[model samples]
Target: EFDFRDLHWCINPPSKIKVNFTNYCDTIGIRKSIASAANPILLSALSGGRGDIFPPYRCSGATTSVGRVFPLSVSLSMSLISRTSEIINMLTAISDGVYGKTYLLVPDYIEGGFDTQKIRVFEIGFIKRWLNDMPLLQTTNYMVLPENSKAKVCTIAVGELTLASLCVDESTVLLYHDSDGSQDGILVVTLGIFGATPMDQVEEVIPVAHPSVEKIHITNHRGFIKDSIATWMVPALVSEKQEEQKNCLESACQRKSYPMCNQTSWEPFGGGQLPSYGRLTLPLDPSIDLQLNISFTYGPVILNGDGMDYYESPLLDSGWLTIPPKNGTVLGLINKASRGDQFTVIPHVLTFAPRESSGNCYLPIQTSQIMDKDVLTESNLVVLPTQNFRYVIATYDISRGDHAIVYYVYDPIRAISYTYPFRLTTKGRPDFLRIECFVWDDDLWCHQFYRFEADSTNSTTSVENLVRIRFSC
Candidate 1:
């Protein structure tokens, strides 16, 4: 009564079909086969031979064959040894766990994508032990979850477990991947109990939001499933918690301390606060003159002109007055002279206590000369001295068409002298001289001067002059 095709089916009932329950189970088997077959080809290709085209151990009586026979067996043996060595090396590198560690879990090695709804469980405890090669395992009370935990319950569970671990140990840190994709991203939560009387009344909470996952693509050009996400959530989470603890400690210390004042009470015989002491001193005398005689000398004159060295007078109305050369002719007497035709002059000279008609009389030195020495405190000022003196001199150059005026101030008590308005003129490549005099003793006087010429024609001139003073008791 049945059809011919149905007659055989009726005679033999079909067995149940075993559906694969795990993710990528089918692809994994297929990949294993492909890998087995490709091994010999890859090896031969690496060895540089045409044997790559033949299946292992199949070729016979061939001169170009990579091996006599049993090539697959030989290649498999070598591959096993190499793989063993690699595993040993990896284990050795992770023996101490001091460098920290990372773990990756994938459902399928050959698949291009993951199932968004499926839970991706990570065995953190296993990973920690494996990396550290320790018999015991421990975890912090912290966890991570994708943005949407409903679809990926395993990922949520793993993240939650990590968070729980961190909560138990305040020192522990957890790292997780956070991405915006529906099935990706990591959420980190820190749990702490806070209540007035009991810690039990407190609840766990997340202090920060999820962070993004960093992705790294493999160079093999493999599909998306083979690519792994590099998430650095662990260190970031740990660091934040550490900072929080530090702040908490600081606040506690600040709360426990109080301000103090150790001022002494100024009380008179009555044991009550007394009025502040009234001004007790008179003002200094204003009529007395504190002036000290600080003498310095005047010039070495230079004269020059545009083309001819003629002593022509400058126009008084032009805000400049010219000094004639020492040729016995005054400048104002000259006539019919243009300003350009006039000479530019600079004079350098040394002046000391000019000898009066009377013989030298000892001037009272208020402070010992040996007790005072110039200390160069400013970085801009340099102290340079010659072998002939004990004091230092500072020299500066005046450029062409430039003039400087110097003034000298003497401090009798400090036994120090300062020169100001030290004038110099940059004319006709002249050299200006500056000298300082000091009495070493009642009978001896010493003078020091540094002489150098300024070449106005060459913008860079070495014209420098220095003054130094030193004395003995």
Candidate 2:
């Protein structure tokens, strides 16, 4: 027992086929065509899902017109794609034009095609709510049944019906009658006569009609008035009265701090004296070169076949080389020339900045100021035996300021204050800037003092020379 909710047919007669429906069947008709072959003329009069039902999901109007009439024979133009397609005189009294004018029989050909033998009729059974076999009004077309009660209902594809998905239910048939004989209707099966789900409960289900529903209109989010442009909301202007009052107050504080009536000579303190550097007992080291041997490592612990930590050294037998995750640790071993004055090296803070610029200090020359920004590395504070090494594990792809290293030398007895600012070249060497003393001459503050090539002696001659003191007498 297969279902025939729609107007459909099988090719030939199966041995024992039966018409099964939920509601009582509407009157059925079987007509034979003498043309050799029969096309598979299958039509689904009943809407299969709620999406195909009509009369909208949540709309109400009186359905009193198609109440009593039940037409036995069906006549319809099975044109699926036109507005003119319809089922003519569908709900009329069966006795009037019952036999001769019935066009519900399967035709020999359809859509310019042909097929073979099948004859069967499936009609409506009573839907629940006694609202099953009701006619639905489609467009504002021919909907009123004549005084003879011959009703002509328009037909539309169930999909084209407005809100059909939300309105229609499964296994429901909607017969829409057109008052003016215009064709636009749908047949649908709903969840129940009373919609099981309310249309209000379904949110955001209204679809847009292209070239019709929501046309393009240029407007701001506030709405459609072009003249409603927003103002810049400028702040009020400053007052001159408050400005003059502040200047008067500042003048009073300046006069009270410095009395003007002292008859003493007003030469500034130090009598125009300039700061001078104490002669160095020992000469500055000209061979300082810093190199960083850094390697990255991080991953799951990898073991060899023997369950031992594997090393990729040449001494190892057949082994696997460990490659760490992209996120890893950097092991940096910083090396400097062994013959320098045992100078302290401070690494610049890993901070982001624009490219090198004038009047901008990358690494602070004052060790105290440097410590305030970032704590001194262990290697920076104490001279560890052998090479200085640090294990750094942090974010890798950070854009950072220009790299620089600062090292300084100070002799308390001689009062020598030598500060060196070394900007790293692409190869990480002291290739830029010069070594200078903090005890500055008036003209020496802005001048490059001693320039040196990497691993080479100082190329610039000093304006003042210092003699090396001999300790053993």
Top TM-score model: 1
- Please give the distance, in angstroms, between residue 339's alpha carbon in candidate 2 and its true position after superposition: 5.7
Return the top candidate by lDDT. 1
Residue 201, candidate 1: alpha-carbon lDDT: 12
Locate the minimum summed-lDDT window of 10 residues in model 1. Answer: 218-227
- What tens digits encode model 2's per-residue C-alpha lDDT throughout 1-473? 65768658757422222333211122111111210111121111223112221222334532211112222212221221022222221111110001001111222343334533222111111111113432221121111112221111111101111111111121111122222464222221111111222111121221211211111110000000011111000001112322432333233323322321121221111111111100001110112111111111111111101101111111212111211111011122111111112211122222112233331211111122222333122111111111112111111111224332322211222221222223333222222221111111110111121112333443321111111111111
Clashes of each: 42, 35
Cα lDDT for residue 90, model 2? 17
